[PDB]
Design a protein around this nucleic acid. Sequence first.
RNA 1: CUACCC
RNA 2: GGGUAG
Length: 1203
Amino acid sequence: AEITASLVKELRERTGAGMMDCKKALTEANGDIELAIENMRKSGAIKAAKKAGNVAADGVIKTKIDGNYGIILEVNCQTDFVAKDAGFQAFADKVLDAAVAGKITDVEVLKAQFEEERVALVAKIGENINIRRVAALEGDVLGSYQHGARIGVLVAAKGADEELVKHIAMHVAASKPEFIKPEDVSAEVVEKEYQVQLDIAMQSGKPKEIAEKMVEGRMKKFTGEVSLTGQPFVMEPSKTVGQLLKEHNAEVTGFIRFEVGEGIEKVETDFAAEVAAMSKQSHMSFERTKPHVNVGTIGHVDHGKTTLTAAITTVLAKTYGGNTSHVEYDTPTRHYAHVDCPGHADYVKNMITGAAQMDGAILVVAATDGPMPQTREHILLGRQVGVPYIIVFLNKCDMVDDEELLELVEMEVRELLSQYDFPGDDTPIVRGSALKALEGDAEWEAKILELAGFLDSYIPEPERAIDKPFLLPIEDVFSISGRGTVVTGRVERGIIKVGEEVEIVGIKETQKSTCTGVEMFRKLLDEGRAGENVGVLLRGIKREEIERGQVLAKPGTIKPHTKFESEVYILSKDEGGRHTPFFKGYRPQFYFRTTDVTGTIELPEGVEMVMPGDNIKMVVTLIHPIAMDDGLRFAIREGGRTVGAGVVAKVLSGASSRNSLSAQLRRAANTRIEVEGNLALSIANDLLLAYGQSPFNSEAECISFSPRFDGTPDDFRINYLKAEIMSKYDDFSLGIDTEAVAWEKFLAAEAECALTNARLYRPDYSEDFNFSLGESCIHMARRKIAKLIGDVPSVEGMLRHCRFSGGATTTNNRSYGHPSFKFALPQACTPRALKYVLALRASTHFDIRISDISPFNKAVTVPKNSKTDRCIAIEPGWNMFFQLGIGGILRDRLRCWGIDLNDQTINQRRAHEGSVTNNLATVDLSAASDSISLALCELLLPPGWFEVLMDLRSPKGRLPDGSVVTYEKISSMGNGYTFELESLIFASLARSVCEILDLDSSEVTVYGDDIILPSCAVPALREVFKYVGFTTNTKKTFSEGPFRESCGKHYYSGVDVTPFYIRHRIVSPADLILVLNNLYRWATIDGVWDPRAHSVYLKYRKLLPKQLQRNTIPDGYGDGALVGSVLINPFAKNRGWIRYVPVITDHTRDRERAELGSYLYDLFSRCLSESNAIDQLICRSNPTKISRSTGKFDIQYIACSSR
RNA sequence: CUACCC
RNA sequence: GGGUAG
Ligand SMILES: Nc1nc2c(ncn2[C@@H]2O[C@H](COP(=O)(O)OP(=O)(O)OP(=O)(O)O)[C@@H](O)[C@H]2O)c(=O)[nH]1
Ligand SMILES: [Ca+2]
Ligand SMILES: [Ca+2]
């Protein structure tokens, strides 16, 4: 205590400075007013210049116009909350209309003209409030659209008005052009990239007017992009602005656009990172049913929330015990989760998208200075985001020596709470210092204990989801003879016991029914707890009365509505959403619980465009009701892709494509086209000519032409595609060929496999003397295998990996391939493999139908080359179930050698390296999966594994030739684990060939047969393989070349030469859409054609029907249409502020699904679920439907985007 | 159930 | 069979 705490307030409410900055500027002011304030006025610029190592990343833009004189601004702070407050507003508004009177262009002018007032606020607040930039534009008619606060645009036109300059400023705001015309560039910024790409291009070997053409066209596009001219108007992205302008009676001159924090780059601060470092300094000086409470810390920057969250960690470590950017710590009763609230607009994008909700925020305010002016925006963010409860902590109280003065600050926070309808009178306020508690000062450590003593009490215990009014999302429905109607899904909330009454509410009149019973897969329980994945039986109600997305809750618990107010975030461009804003008539689908629902939206008063990366309040009125209550997270899909997220706020009162077009296309889609011969051979020929290269003379040369491996990448690429494109043309006329040849090989794949299987059974040469390279590797591989594998497949890892999947079984066929027709229909087991199926049968109360019991798999033939076919083999559907389980445990496990098979990227990326590096070699075997000996496999795998592989495998096979064979190969293609095994085998050995040569085994990467290793190892790997039986595809194995190929990617000196193949006979316009598209990808860079390919594209493009030449789509959307610019598509209609397009689909008459087997599978899926932009968790899995390919083509409509 | 591939 | 995007 020094002087009275009383009229220190006289300082504050006449000044606005700190509390102790007021008392301490009074202790050396002799109890005087003015001369105390003059200390502040002079010692306010000292702190104001203390602000310079505080980067100002936030702020506002403000804009003004008079008659036809317009001005923008970039006055900016370092925090949202400040910018939105009535102070930063008042100054920045003032400093804006100061440019209205005086056309101030030099920022220096007004940056100085208010420097003495710029300090009046940073002394009041505590942030580097500095003006960044200013500019202004004069003209005829100049309009300005202000996007809330963050983006300001000033644009000047001619012949235009508010029915325009508004709308185009919106585009400038939206599209962000740097220039205005393609002619508005310097022949230096142009001849920069014009000499930057010309080498990039010419290095390839492409002539003068190829590279020159290509580059000029690409730069013509590059210019065209930023070209406000060459820019698709944001409200009509069909016509360009420049086109919109000339088509209008008008012509703009100039434009100014500011955002906030351009270039103000900075470095990204994590919270949970630096707080583990703020702690690390002070470091050196049963009950798991305990609730989760999401707390947040909120307050000024320099009041050091940072410092306090740290104390609330260490002092809680000291005492009890112990979405990233959050800290997980405990308390003896509860377990919290704690986050920082720096950005108002980034906390909404946390609550809305649900990355971090709030069950109670903590209000940090340094007692030294008390409530800052912008704090009412912190408290405002609470009663804006609907935070339930609020605890306040006054940090740094040692910096006050008078309690009579501390009690005065609670006044100025308790009344600041109460303005915002928070229990200010009855709200907890802790007085202490974190700084003292970081140390070891337990007198002040009792304050964090007094604070954490409030989170334990003043925050209510979260209604644990079990305890909430029962509710289940209807995910799918089955009509079982014997059970009636049954729905499956994970129950969201509550418990459902057998018999209770439930409503079935969703779209129809909220009907009601009763739980005839509940069941899982193994258990057939009687109560269904929340969080569990179940199937509930309903009576007196059939399937057709129950849709999906319906809920299944207690009666009256939740009513169905269709009108509600919500708040949503829209995914930014870089986040996945639209790269285009929408306007008044947005009509998306609203993905709710399990189903998508379309719907219109209103914009609140005064907002007219919203862009990717926005928060926004809106009112949603969807086409037909869904059951809802406040707190329901719904994403927002546009044609299957999630471009928004949002939660319902308040539930309310309640309330163009040409069909002739689609039908015109459907007509033409089925238009079989007629050619005077082989269209392919024609196209490929007329293409080779298009490149100087000598064409095919006969139809034999298509597959007997071997390329050359010299020449420029260009001389290659083409020469390669030549030898490659035709390879797979099945329909070759006097192709005196067959599939018999496929069989002829499969005979060696056992005939050799015989030879090895045998000679692989006597490794004692004669007497010990000779020591072979193979045997050694096997020995090494064997050891290596078992460290990776196990002595036997863990049933744990076995059951949660086995599945019914795909297509043909011995008992089924491609029609009856979908998994439900495996539980419905009995599948074949195999003698040895019986025991497992029996396990399944005591593993559930369901029906496990074994049809025949035979050791036979059907060996057949599927098409491959034009010179041969495959000889896959269709396994006994039960063997396949387990084979797929051991194929999965042998794959998740195979990932420790750095082998990922659900990612063939990491094996083709390395083909890239190899093509340049020359130290990596791609390899290929002749009959890969087929030449794996029953002998070899025994020598490597553990005996316990080699059992389970002899058990599941099919030992004998019946041919179409009637004749049986007994497998020398352990496993054939089509077998349910063969891929993973041959991976692991090949990987095993490459790696042994590595250790054996003092080489990193970690440099070995295998994908099935597509194994990649160090180039030096190859002749050893080759000599190993020669021994272990396999034989090496010299033609496809590449070590010394400039060329590497792997996982379907081909490379030549780091350069992409992946060809495309013309498989089957081109006939329907879908087969020409397809070929024209592969040639489009193969010869384009960003919609910019390699000229001499464009020639044939354009030519054979004429072959398609008139409408089927203009119907373009972006790449990566299918082949239902030619890829091109969808901005052009005449058939593309603008529905609901989202563009929709028509693409060729295959026709499907629907069919009957096995309600039994579909249900059997749906609940088997939940057994496999249960034992295995942060918002895709919302979206669930799909019901089983079956459909049959008719032959006709239908036209389906989808959703699209520019680029 | 369309493309790409091991 | 298996990935990968539809
Ligand atoms: N089970 C199964 N595996 C396949 C099939 N197609 C390709 N593969 C895998 O792809 C690997 C290599 O395929 P390819 O390189 O095309 O054929 P390959 O039989 O191994 O030998 P070649 O084509 O003669 O060089 C094989 O080991 C197979 O495991 C198939 O239809 N069924
Ligand atoms: Ca191969
Ligand atoms: Ca290969």
